[PDB]
Amino acid sequence: GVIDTWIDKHRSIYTAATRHAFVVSIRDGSVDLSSFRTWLGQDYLFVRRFVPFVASVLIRACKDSGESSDMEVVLGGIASLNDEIEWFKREGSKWDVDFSTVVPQRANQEYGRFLEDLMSSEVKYPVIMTAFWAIEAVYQESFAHCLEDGNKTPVELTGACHRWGNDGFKQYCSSVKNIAERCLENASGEVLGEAEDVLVRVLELEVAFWEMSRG
Ligand SMILES: Cc1ncc(CO)c(N)n1
């Protein structure tokens, strides 16, 4: 399809963007949590900003309705975010990450302003859906096979893997893809170019975000 074609075209940045969110390794005989704790702090601040952006997609889905059922897909997405935020707070407490002292880094602030740019009614529905799909799908790709990979490493943390590695989140992403894909198959050349640039921009922001916590 249209999205699959863009991913192929842009395979290189898509691979770069979907590397593991954090690495847990042994250092000097201890488990090094520095990459995990950096990711947790930064990603929690990203998720708090992702919430109103999904809220804006939900509104658009209720008004810009070629399909009635788009709303329920986005609504399930935002309801998951509720459970996600609670999970993040539970992680912060068990791992001593104080979210009130996390400083959002450059890549995180850039990503947040970009989410703001996508919240305007001046942006076309197919473009907003592409961005929403992409942000979700990069987490699905990056956590794919996390259990089996994690089992092959000497120490693994299991929490994040349960969150984005499960079949429920995979199926969710597919259902969001099906919506984006439908919008793009009815889109003009101009909107199609806009959607592709937005896809590319999400991948670029994800590479930069990833670089904050790399091992
Ligand atoms: C940076 C980033 N991209 C995507 C997601 C999907 O939730 C996330 N949590 N964080």
Side-chain angles (χ1 to χ4, degrees):
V2 179
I3 294 157
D4 296 335
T5 297
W6 292 338
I7 295 309
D8 278 341
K9 179 186 176 179
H10 297 294
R11 192 92 237 168
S12 190
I13 198 176
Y14 179 79
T15 304
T18 52
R19 297 179 67 176
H20 293 131
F22 57 86
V23 295
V24 171
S25 74
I26 309 175
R27 272 199 213 266
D28 188 21
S30 281
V31 177
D32 179 18
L33 302 170
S34 65
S35 152
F36 169 69
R37 298 158 75 86
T38 304
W39 169 83
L40 188 69
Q42 290 304 312
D43 211 55
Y44 176 63
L45 294 183
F46 172 84
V47 171
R48 293 192 71 86
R49 285 185 153 257
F50 191 55
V51 173
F53 163 72
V54 183
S56 73
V57 174
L58 179 59
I59 297 164
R60 299 297 297 281
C62 298
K63 53 159 154 160
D64 296 56
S65 143
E67 296 302 330
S68 227
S69 47
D70 285 6
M71 166 214 296
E72 290 102 307
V73 171
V74 188
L75 185 54
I78 205 176
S80 281
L81 293 181
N82 188 51
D83 291 329
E84 268 192 46
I85 279 151
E86 288 163 350
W87 178 83
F88 268 102
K89 295 171 170 186
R90 294 200 294 279
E91 297 290 301
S93 163
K94 76 165 81 148
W95 295 113
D96 296 359
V97 178
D98 181 353
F99 297 128
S100 73
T101 52
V102 174
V103 183
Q105 301 292 296
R106 177 176 188 191
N108 212 355
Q109 297 155 346
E110 245 155 56
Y111 213 150
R113 176 168 292 133
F114 179 69
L115 296 187
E116 292 171 321
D117 288 345
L118 295 174
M119 296 171 62
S120 156
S121 36
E122 299 305 314
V123 186
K124 293 313 170 282
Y125 187 60
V127 173
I128 288 152
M129 289 300 317
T130 300
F132 177 47
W133 167 78
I135 300 165
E136 301 285 46
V138 293
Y139 262 35
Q140 193 280 325
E141 185 78 64
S142 84
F143 283 97
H145 311 301
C146 56
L147 184 60
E148 134 190 287
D149 292 356
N151 193 35
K152 289 168 180 154
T153 69
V155 48
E156 63 185 306
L157 303 205
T158 59
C161 180
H162 290 320
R163 277 283 139 182
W164 296 281
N166 67 66
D167 177 65
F169 186 69
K170 191 174 154 75
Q171 303 324 336
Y172 182 64
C173 291
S174 290
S175 74
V176 175
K177 200 182 185 186
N178 293 355
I179 299 168
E181 178 65 36
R182 175 203 83 232
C183 291
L184 296 160
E185 283 173 28
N186 307 334
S188 68
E190 189 190 284
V191 171
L192 281 172
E194 294 161 8
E196 196 188 355
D197 294 338
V198 166
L199 173 51
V200 172
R201 181 76 175 140
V202 166
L203 299 175
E204 292 170 349
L205 289 165
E206 287 286 348
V207 173
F209 192 99
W210 177 90
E211 287 170 345
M212 306 180 297
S213 320
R214 63 219 189 88

Short mmCIF file of all heavy atoms in Angstrom, two decimals, residues 39 42-44 46-47 50 81 84 88 108 111 134-140 143 164 169 202 205-206 209-210 212, ligand 1:
data_model
loop_
_atom_site.label_atom_id
_atom_site.label_comp_id
_atom_site.label_asym_id
_atom_site.label_seq_id
_atom_site.Cartn_x
_atom_site.Cartn_y
_atom_site.Cartn_z
N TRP A 39 15.51 7.19 29.29
CA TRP A 39 14.30 6.93 28.48
C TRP A 39 12.99 7.11 29.26
O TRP A 39 12.03 7.75 28.77
CB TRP A 39 14.33 5.51 27.86
CG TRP A 39 13.00 5.17 27.26
CD1 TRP A 39 12.55 5.52 26.03
CD2 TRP A 39 11.93 4.45 27.90
NE1 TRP A 39 11.26 5.06 25.84
CE2 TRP A 39 10.85 4.42 26.99
CE3 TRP A 39 11.78 3.84 29.15
CZ2 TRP A 39 9.65 3.78 27.28
CZ3 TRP A 39 10.56 3.21 29.44
CH2 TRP A 39 9.52 3.19 28.50
N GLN A 42 12.36 10.89 30.03
CA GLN A 42 12.10 11.64 28.82
C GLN A 42 10.81 11.14 28.21
O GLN A 42 9.98 11.95 27.79
CB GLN A 42 13.23 11.50 27.78
CG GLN A 42 14.58 12.24 28.18
CD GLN A 42 14.43 13.75 28.47
OE1 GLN A 42 13.81 14.51 27.71
NE2 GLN A 42 14.98 14.17 29.59
N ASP A 43 10.66 9.83 28.08
CA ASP A 43 9.42 9.33 27.47
C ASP A 43 8.13 9.63 28.24
O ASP A 43 7.06 9.77 27.64
CB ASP A 43 9.47 7.84 27.18
CG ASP A 43 8.64 7.49 25.97
OD1 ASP A 43 8.89 8.09 24.89
OD2 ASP A 43 7.74 6.64 26.11
N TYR A 44 8.20 9.69 29.56
CA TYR A 44 7.04 10.14 30.31
C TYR A 44 6.63 11.59 29.95
O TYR A 44 5.42 11.92 29.90
CB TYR A 44 7.37 10.11 31.80
CG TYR A 44 6.27 10.65 32.68
CD1 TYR A 44 5.03 10.01 32.73
CD2 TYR A 44 6.45 11.83 33.44
CE1 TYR A 44 4.02 10.46 33.55
CE2 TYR A 44 5.43 12.30 34.27
CZ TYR A 44 4.21 11.57 34.32
OH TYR A 44 3.13 11.94 35.08
N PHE A 46 7.35 13.03 27.12
CA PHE A 46 6.76 12.96 25.76
C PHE A 46 5.26 12.52 25.78
O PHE A 46 4.42 13.06 25.07
CB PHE A 46 7.57 11.99 24.88
CG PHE A 46 6.93 11.72 23.55
CD1 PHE A 46 7.12 12.60 22.46
CD2 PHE A 46 6.11 10.61 23.39
CE1 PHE A 46 6.51 12.35 21.24
CE2 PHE A 46 5.49 10.35 22.15
CZ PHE A 46 5.70 11.20 21.08
N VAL A 47 4.95 11.51 26.57
CA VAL A 47 3.61 10.94 26.64
C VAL A 47 2.61 11.97 27.15
O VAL A 47 1.51 12.03 26.61
CB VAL A 47 3.57 9.63 27.46
CG1 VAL A 47 2.14 9.17 27.69
CG2 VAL A 47 4.35 8.54 26.73
N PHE A 50 1.95 13.91 24.17
CA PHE A 50 1.23 13.08 23.21
C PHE A 50 -0.29 12.98 23.53
O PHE A 50 -1.09 12.89 22.62
CB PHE A 50 1.88 11.67 23.18
CG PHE A 50 1.41 10.79 22.05
CD1 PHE A 50 1.50 11.20 20.74
CD2 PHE A 50 0.97 9.48 22.31
CE1 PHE A 50 1.08 10.38 19.70
CE2 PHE A 50 0.58 8.63 21.28
CZ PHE A 50 0.61 9.09 19.96
N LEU A 81 -3.58 5.44 26.86
CA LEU A 81 -2.69 6.44 27.40
C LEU A 81 -2.97 6.69 28.87
O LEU A 81 -2.04 6.90 29.64
CB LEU A 81 -2.72 7.75 26.59
CG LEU A 81 -2.17 7.67 25.15
CD1 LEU A 81 -2.26 9.08 24.49
CD2 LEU A 81 -0.76 7.07 25.04
N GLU A 84 -1.20 3.90 30.52
CA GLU A 84 0.21 4.19 30.34
C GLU A 84 0.76 5.16 31.33
O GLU A 84 1.81 4.90 31.92
CB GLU A 84 0.51 4.77 28.99
CG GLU A 84 0.85 3.79 27.98
CD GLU A 84 1.41 4.43 26.77
OE1 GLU A 84 2.28 5.32 26.90
OE2 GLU A 84 1.01 4.03 25.66
N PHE A 88 3.69 4.48 33.98
CA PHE A 88 4.89 5.36 34.10
C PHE A 88 5.12 5.84 35.53
O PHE A 88 6.24 5.83 36.03
CB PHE A 88 4.80 6.58 33.17
CG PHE A 88 5.43 6.38 31.81
CD1 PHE A 88 4.62 6.14 30.70
CD2 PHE A 88 6.82 6.47 31.62
CE1 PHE A 88 5.15 5.99 29.42
CE2 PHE A 88 7.37 6.33 30.35
CZ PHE A 88 6.55 6.10 29.23
N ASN A 108 13.39 16.13 22.70
CA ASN A 108 12.09 16.04 23.31
C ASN A 108 11.24 17.34 23.14
O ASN A 108 10.05 17.31 22.80
CB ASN A 108 12.25 15.66 24.79
CG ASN A 108 11.11 14.84 25.30
OD1 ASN A 108 10.12 14.61 24.59
ND2 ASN A 108 11.24 14.36 26.53
N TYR A 111 10.17 17.56 19.42
CA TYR A 111 9.09 16.61 19.18
C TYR A 111 7.80 17.22 19.69
O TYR A 111 6.80 17.22 18.99
CB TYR A 111 9.37 15.25 19.88
CG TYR A 111 8.83 14.06 19.11
CD1 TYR A 111 9.46 12.82 19.21
CD2 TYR A 111 7.66 14.16 18.29
CE1 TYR A 111 9.00 11.71 18.51
CE2 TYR A 111 7.17 13.03 17.58
CZ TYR A 111 7.85 11.82 17.71
OH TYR A 111 7.43 10.69 17.07
N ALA A 134 2.23 6.69 12.71
CA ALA A 134 3.69 6.52 12.74
C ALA A 134 4.24 6.47 14.15
O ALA A 134 5.10 5.64 14.45
CB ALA A 134 4.43 7.66 11.93
N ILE A 135 3.84 7.43 14.97
CA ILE A 135 4.28 7.50 16.35
C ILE A 135 3.97 6.15 17.08
O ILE A 135 4.86 5.59 17.74
CB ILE A 135 3.64 8.72 17.11
CG1 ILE A 135 4.04 10.04 16.42
CG2 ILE A 135 4.06 8.69 18.57
CD1 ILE A 135 3.24 11.28 16.82
N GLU A 136 2.74 5.63 16.92
CA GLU A 136 2.37 4.33 17.51
C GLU A 136 3.19 3.17 16.94
O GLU A 136 3.77 2.37 17.69
CB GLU A 136 0.85 4.03 17.38
CG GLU A 136 -0.10 5.05 18.04
CD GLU A 136 -0.18 4.96 19.56
OE1 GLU A 136 0.87 4.87 20.20
OE2 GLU A 136 -1.29 5.04 20.13
N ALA A 137 3.26 3.12 15.61
CA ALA A 137 3.94 2.05 14.90
C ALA A 137 5.44 1.97 15.20
O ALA A 137 5.99 0.89 15.23
CB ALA A 137 3.71 2.20 13.41
N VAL A 138 6.13 3.10 15.38
CA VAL A 138 7.55 3.01 15.75
C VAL A 138 7.78 2.30 17.10
O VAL A 138 8.76 1.58 17.26
CB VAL A 138 8.30 4.36 15.76
CG1 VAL A 138 8.41 4.95 14.35
CG2 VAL A 138 7.65 5.30 16.71
N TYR A 139 6.87 2.50 18.06
CA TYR A 139 6.94 1.76 19.31
C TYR A 139 6.62 0.28 19.15
O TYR A 139 7.30 -0.55 19.77
CB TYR A 139 6.20 2.45 20.47
CG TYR A 139 7.25 3.21 21.29
CD1 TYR A 139 8.35 3.80 20.62
CD2 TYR A 139 7.17 3.33 22.71
CE1 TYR A 139 9.36 4.49 21.30
CE2 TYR A 139 8.21 4.05 23.42
CZ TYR A 139 9.30 4.62 22.69
OH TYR A 139 10.31 5.36 23.27
N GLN A 140 5.66 -0.05 18.30
CA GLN A 140 5.36 -1.44 18.00
C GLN A 140 6.57 -2.12 17.34
O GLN A 140 6.93 -3.28 17.69
CB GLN A 140 4.12 -1.55 17.09
CG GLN A 140 3.52 -2.95 16.95
CD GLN A 140 4.26 -3.83 15.98
OE1 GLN A 140 4.77 -3.37 14.96
NE2 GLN A 140 4.33 -5.14 16.30
N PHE A 143 9.61 -2.51 19.91
CA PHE A 143 9.39 -3.50 20.95
C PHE A 143 8.99 -4.86 20.40
O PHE A 143 8.73 -5.78 21.17
CB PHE A 143 8.36 -3.00 21.98
CG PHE A 143 8.93 -2.02 22.94
CD1 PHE A 143 8.76 -0.64 22.73
CD2 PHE A 143 9.68 -2.46 24.06
CE1 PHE A 143 9.29 0.30 23.64
CE2 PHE A 143 10.25 -1.54 24.96
CZ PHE A 143 10.05 -0.15 24.76
N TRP A 164 4.41 -2.31 25.23
CA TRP A 164 4.35 -2.08 23.78
C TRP A 164 4.65 -3.34 22.96
O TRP A 164 4.60 -3.29 21.74
CB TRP A 164 5.28 -0.91 23.38
CG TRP A 164 4.84 0.38 24.00
CD1 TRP A 164 3.82 1.18 23.56
CD2 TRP A 164 5.36 1.00 25.19
NE1 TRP A 164 3.69 2.27 24.39
CE2 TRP A 164 4.62 2.19 25.40
CE3 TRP A 164 6.39 0.68 26.08
CZ2 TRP A 164 4.84 3.03 26.48
CZ3 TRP A 164 6.62 1.52 27.16
CH2 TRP A 164 5.85 2.67 27.35
N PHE A 169 -1.40 -4.40 21.48
CA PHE A 169 -0.84 -3.16 20.91
C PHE A 169 -0.50 -3.31 19.42
O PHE A 169 -0.72 -2.38 18.61
CB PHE A 169 0.34 -2.67 21.72
CG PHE A 169 0.87 -1.34 21.27
CD1 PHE A 169 0.11 -0.18 21.45
CD2 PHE A 169 2.10 -1.24 20.63
CE1 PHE A 169 0.57 1.07 21.04
CE2 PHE A 169 2.58 0.04 20.19
CZ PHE A 169 1.80 1.18 20.40
N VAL A 202 8.40 12.57 11.57
CA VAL A 202 8.29 11.70 12.77
C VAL A 202 9.52 10.77 12.91
O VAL A 202 10.10 10.65 13.99
CB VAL A 202 6.98 10.84 12.75
CG1 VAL A 202 7.03 9.71 13.81
CG2 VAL A 202 5.72 11.71 12.97
N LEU A 205 12.49 12.78 14.10
CA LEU A 205 12.34 13.11 15.51
C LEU A 205 12.55 11.86 16.41
O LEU A 205 13.03 11.97 17.50
CB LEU A 205 10.96 13.78 15.76
CG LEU A 205 10.80 15.20 15.22
CD1 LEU A 205 9.34 15.59 15.20
CD2 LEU A 205 11.61 16.20 16.06
N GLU A 206 12.18 10.69 15.92
CA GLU A 206 12.31 9.47 16.70
C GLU A 206 13.80 9.09 16.80
O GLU A 206 14.24 8.66 17.85
CB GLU A 206 11.49 8.33 16.08
CG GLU A 206 9.94 8.46 16.26
CD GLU A 206 9.45 8.16 17.68
OE1 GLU A 206 10.23 7.65 18.51
OE2 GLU A 206 8.28 8.44 17.97
N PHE A 209 15.26 11.54 19.30
CA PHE A 209 14.77 11.15 20.63
C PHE A 209 15.58 9.95 21.17
O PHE A 209 16.03 9.93 22.32
CB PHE A 209 13.29 10.75 20.53
CG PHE A 209 12.62 10.62 21.87
CD1 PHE A 209 11.85 11.66 22.37
CD2 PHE A 209 12.82 9.48 22.66
CE1 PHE A 209 11.24 11.55 23.64
CE2 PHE A 209 12.21 9.36 23.92
CZ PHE A 209 11.41 10.40 24.41
N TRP A 210 15.73 8.95 20.31
CA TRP A 210 16.46 7.71 20.62
C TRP A 210 17.90 7.98 21.06
O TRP A 210 18.41 7.36 22.01
CB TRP A 210 16.40 6.79 19.37
CG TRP A 210 17.17 5.51 19.53
CD1 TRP A 210 16.70 4.32 20.01
CD2 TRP A 210 18.55 5.30 19.19
NE1 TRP A 210 17.71 3.38 20.01
CE2 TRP A 210 18.86 3.96 19.52
CE3 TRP A 210 19.57 6.11 18.68
CZ2 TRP A 210 20.14 3.42 19.34
CZ3 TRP A 210 20.84 5.57 18.50
CH2 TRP A 210 21.11 4.25 18.83
N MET A 212 19.01 10.32 22.69
CA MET A 212 19.15 10.75 24.09
C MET A 212 19.56 9.61 25.06
O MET A 212 20.36 9.85 25.96
CB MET A 212 17.92 11.50 24.61
CG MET A 212 17.49 12.69 23.76
SD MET A 212 15.91 13.45 24.64
CE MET A 212 14.65 11.91 24.50
C1 LIG B 1 9.36 8.84 21.47
C2 LIG B 1 8.15 7.99 21.48
N1 LIG B 1 7.59 7.59 20.29
C3 LIG B 1 6.50 6.82 20.24
C4 LIG B 1 5.86 6.44 21.44
C5 LIG B 1 4.63 5.55 21.37
O1 LIG B 1 3.97 5.60 22.64
C6 LIG B 1 6.45 6.84 22.65
N2 LIG B 1 5.86 6.43 23.81
N3 LIG B 1 7.60 7.61 22.64
#
